[PDB]
């Protein structure tokens, strides 16, 4: 299509700290690619982000009811919806599967990369360390960062640059909220 | 910390909006406009929770309203297209002849309109596939996920084919074992 496009995008946000002790609610409105007007719980009133949203910041902020309702969203909207989502979202935990393979580096004793594949886990907080004979490799780590699979799982790869020589043992050590003691997979040359 | 976002949008002249809930960057559910019903991202989400679909179709109608308002108010400024970044990968490391899934990750784009297509060995695969609605990003843009369940093999190659207005030609992203 050759025609132009016009995009209205309202976003209602709930931000939670210390579980649910501190909540912050934002009602944000985006015309095409700019934010026009916003409500911020920590501010207490609507506030025009750009010129386009001044007519509205001004009208709201005048109706006691619009403001009352807004200010009372941390309770009637955010906290309540936490109460629901909590079981299968905040408390959702899924343990990672952890492979250690070399990255097509079949050579006997040249430069290689050791892949620590870590897939299928939730939430996203995870830590992946490499150990050579019980000592923690801290240099030469080519990570992919977190990778949201979009199905409520993640994956990640941390690759170790090494020249393997017979008798060396590399260990990949994965920590994640879904397991008590760290998960490990080793690799021997 | 955690974030729950109720994300709606409405797009003209296409007359198509979306209503969804988003937790730490994953879709909790969306509302199927066509069928006016709730759609959970994972079926067992339906077992702990519920949502009345009508109330969303109201919010969209109000969003249609405010779009036309804010469009007039803006002297009919249109949106700058932002072509997507595309990436193909698999949800778990590959093991030949053992089922897996190809993930097409369309990121960092707007407006929320693309055409995605899976091509096994050049032909389009229309069976087995699923997609996610446009997930909000923080920078006012969108991300989307297309899924092809597939059987890894040395005799097969695949491409994800994305078509966006901010793109010159269609974008092919390639994947083959090795």
């Amino acid at each position: 299509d050759t025609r132009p496009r016009f995009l209205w995008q309202p976003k209602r946000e709930c931000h939670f700290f210390n579980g649910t002790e501190r909540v912050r609610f934002l009602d944000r409105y985006f015309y095409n690619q700019e934010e026009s007007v916003r409500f911020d719980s920590d501010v207490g009133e609507f506030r025009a982000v750009t010129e386009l949203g001044r007519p509205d910041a001004e009208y709201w902020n005048s109706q006691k009811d619009i403001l009352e309702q807004a200010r009372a969203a941390v309770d009637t909207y955010c906290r309540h919806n936490y109460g629901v989502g909590e079981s299968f979202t905040v408390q959702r935990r899924v343990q990672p599967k952890v492979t250690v393979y070399p990255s097509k580096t079949q050579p006997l004793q040249h430069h290689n990369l050791l892949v620590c594949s870590v897939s299928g886990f939730y939430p996203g907080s995870i830590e992946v360390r490499w150990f050579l004979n019980g000592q923690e490799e801290k240099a030469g780590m080519v990570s992919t960062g977190l990778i949201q699979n979009g199905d409520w799982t993640f994956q990640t790869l941390v690759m170790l640059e090494t020249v393997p020589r017979s008798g060396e043992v590399y260990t990949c050590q994965v920590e994640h909220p879904s397991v008590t003691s760290p998960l490990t997979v080793e690799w021997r040359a | 910390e955690h974030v729950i976002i109720q994300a709606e949008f409405y797009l003209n002249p296409d007359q198509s909006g979306e209503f969804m809930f988003d937790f730490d960057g994953d879709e909790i559910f969306h509302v199927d406009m066509a069928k006016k019903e709730t759609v959970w991202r994972l079926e067992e989400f339906g077992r702990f929770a519920s949502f009345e679909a009508q109330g969303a179709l109201a919010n969209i109608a109000v969003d249609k309203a405010n779009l036309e308002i804010m469009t007039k108010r803006s002297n009919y400024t249109p949106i700058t297209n932002v072509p997507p970044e595309v990436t193909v990968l698999t949800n778990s490391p590959v093991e030949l002849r053992e089922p897996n899934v190809l993930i097409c990750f369309i990121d960092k784009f707007t407006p929320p309109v693309v055409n995605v297509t899976w091509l096994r060995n050049g032909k389009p695969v229309t069976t087995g596939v699923s997609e996610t609605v446009f997930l909000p990003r923080e920078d006012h843009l969108f991300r989307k996920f297309h899924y092809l369940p597939f059987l890894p093999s040395t005799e097969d190659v695949y491409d994800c084919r994305v078509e966006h207005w901010g793109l010159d030609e269609p974008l092919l992203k390639h994947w083959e074992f090795d």
Partner: peptide
């Protein structure tokens, strides 16, 4: 078994 709350949002000025 539990119900989620949408937020009806505001009307822009016209």
């Amino acid at each position: 078994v539990l119900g989620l709350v949408l937020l009806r949002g505001e009307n822009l000025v016209s």
